Amino acid sequence: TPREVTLHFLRTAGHPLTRWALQRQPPSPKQLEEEFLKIPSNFVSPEDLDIPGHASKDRYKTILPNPQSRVCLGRAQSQEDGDYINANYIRGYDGKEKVYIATQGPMPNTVSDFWEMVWQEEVSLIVMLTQLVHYWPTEEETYGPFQIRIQDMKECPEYTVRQLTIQYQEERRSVKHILFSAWPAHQTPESAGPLLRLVAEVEESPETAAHPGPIVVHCSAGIGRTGCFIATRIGCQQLKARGEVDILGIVCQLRLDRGGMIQTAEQYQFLHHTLALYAGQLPE
């Protein structure tokens, strides 16, 4: 039973690494390559989704949101004739539910869907990962029923922070948007420092809500760079709380949430490098 075999692996696989082992005696580059290749994709086949006309809202044919964690658009603000967006809820540290939503970058025809999701899910933070569509405005623009305005734009060494507001009827909400460039698909960032500063930027973001909404994280396909970013943050949280990290377990849990998260063995190895660097910053 290939399905049961996949699910059993993802629910049980693990390779705990103490802070010491991570820094001083990590698995060899060959061991990490073989370990990465063993992780099932958990990609859903087009047959496992019965959402007609979903293909026009997917950037890629074979990268699809797993039904169990798929973000469904209730259309409370619109008259749109479906529920579909290529996006999944992602669990965070210790399996906490709906900490993130991983999604593809909006297509010209899914920009309104994207802002609908941001409203419906009470998103206040968006992390965009890219290399050098513009679904946010220069000053002010309307997307479907939503009015979006930019209040501030700040250029940091490695990312740009925009403060936006989104308004529907009487209600206007703040949304922080972080655009991290110099990260090509199927590659790693230039070095781990900027990525760890991005993770810190996210941590430091003020949370106003009583029950915080998911952090939206996106990139072109919504799995490689999003998976690296989310795995990095969860790994840091594990190191800080427990003084050890199970990177294999983190990636397996991400794949349960959205098929294919973290695309390449080089990205998986870079996660180890990044977390070994973060470990040096911890107390003691």
Curated annotation (Swiss-Prot):
PTM field: Phosphorylated on serine residues in resting T-cells. Phosphorylation increases upon exposure to stimuli that increase intracellular cAMP levels. Phosphorylation leads to dissociation of bound MAP kinases.
Class of this enzyme: hydrolase
Species lineage, top-down? Eukaryota, Metazoa, Chordata, Craniata, Vertebrata
Q: Which GO terms describe its biological process?
A: MAPK cascade; protein dephosphorylation; signal transduction
Q: List, from the UniProt record, the residues annotated as the active site of this protein.
A: C219 (phosphocysteine intermediate)
| Whole-protein residues included | 66 to 356 of 360
Impact reported for C219S: Loss of catalytic activity
Organism in which the protein naturally occurs: Homo sapiens (Human)
Q: Which residues carry this modification: Cysteine sulfenic acid (-SOH)?
A: C219
Gene encoding this polypeptide? PTPN7
Domain Tyrosine-protein phosphatase residues, every copy: 32-278
Q: Spell out the protein name for this chain.
A: Tyrosine-protein phosphatase non-receptor type 7
Q: Which GO terms describe its molecular function?
A: non-membrane spanning protein tyrosine phosphatase activity; protein tyrosine phosphatase activity
The entry assigns this protein to a family as follows: Belongs to the protein-tyrosine phosphatase family. Non-receptor class subfamily.
Task: Tell me the disulfide pairings in this chain.
Answer: none
Outcome of swapping T1A? Prevents dissociation of bound MAP kinase and enhances their dephosphorylation
Q: What does this protein do?
A: Protein phosphatase that acts preferentially on tyrosine-phosphorylated MAPK1. Plays a role in the regulation of T and B-lymphocyte development and signal transduction.
UniProt: substrate binding residues: A185, C219, S220, A221, G222, I223, G224, R225, Q263
Query: What is the activity-regulation note?
Result: Inhibited in cells after FCER1A triggering.
Q: Which reaction does it catalyse?
A: O-phospho-L-tyrosyl-[protein] + H2O = L-tyrosyl-[protein] + phosphate
Question: Where in or outside the cell is it found?
Answer: Cytoplasm; Cytoplasm, Cytoskeleton
Self-association state and partner proteins as the record states: Monomer. Interacts with MAPK1, MAPK3 and several other MAP kinases.
EC number annotated for this UniProt entry: 3.1.3.48
